[PDB]
Amino acid sequence: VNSFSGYLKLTDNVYIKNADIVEEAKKVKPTVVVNAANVYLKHGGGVAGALNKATNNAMQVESDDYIATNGPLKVGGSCVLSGHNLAKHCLHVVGPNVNKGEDIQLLKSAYENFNQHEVLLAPLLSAGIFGADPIHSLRVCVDTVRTNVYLAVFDKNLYDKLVSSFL
Numbered sequence: 280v281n282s283f284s285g286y287l288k289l290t291d292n293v294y295i296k297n298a299d300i301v302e303e304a305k306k307v308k309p310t311v312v313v314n315a316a317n318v319y320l321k322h323g324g325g326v327a328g329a330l331n332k333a334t335n336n337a338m339q340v341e342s343d344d345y346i347a348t349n350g351p352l353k354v355g356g357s358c359v360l361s362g363h364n365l366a367k368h369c370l371h372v373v374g375p376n377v378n379k380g381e382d383i384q385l386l387k388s389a390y391e392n393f394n395q396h397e398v399l400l401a402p403l404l405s406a407g408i409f410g411a412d413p414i415h416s417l418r419v420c421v422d423t424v425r426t427n428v429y430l431a432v433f434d435k436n437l438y439d440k441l442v443s444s445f446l
């Protein structure tokens with residue numbers, strides 16, 4: 280038993296909710312919140328800008344030190360940093376950005392990072408300003424992630440379309 284409430288169950292291990300991931304993180308305080316990161320950990324907009332704003336820019340300060348030490352992530356890769364006031368940990372995962380021409384096949388590699396964590400609160404990777412089809416992202420998530428994932432979908436219209444079209 281865990282504290283995630285109001286989710287629709289899609290499969291054995293994947294759950295979905297129309298919710299603001301920032302508000303959901305603030306209420307649940309999950310062990311892991313996933314950020315929709317880029318390779319530079321520049322949290323300017325989309326989910327990342329929202330999560331970072333909620334940390335009063337502490338996420339960005341920590342991220343800049345991480346990059347100065349380690350260099351950029353890979354597309355499809357991840358790193359674990361602090362969750363600040365939102366979660367114990369933040370798993371920064373880089374899905375491909377279609378608006379940069381990145382290979383959509385890397386979306387499966389991106390979701391594989393979730394399997395290193397037993398339970399996660401997460402957005403749909405590569406959705407939103409990353410330019411991928413969220414229906415496709417949900418399918419890759421279900422077919423790749425084996426650990427327990429609670430997906431927060433900000434847009435109600437999109438949420439309803441995701442549920443109604445789910446196979």
Ligand SMILES: O=C(Nc1ccc(C(=O)N[C@H]2c3ccccc3C[C@@H]2C(=O)O)cc1)NC1CC1
Binds near residue numbers: 405406
């Ligand atoms: O501002 C926010 N919360 C916020 C939450 C989500 C996004 C957001 O853009 N989410 C989508 C996104 C973005 C990049 C990559 C993938 C995806 C899939 C995500 C989706 O559609 O569900 C923005 C702001 N709270 C402040 C109180 C106001």
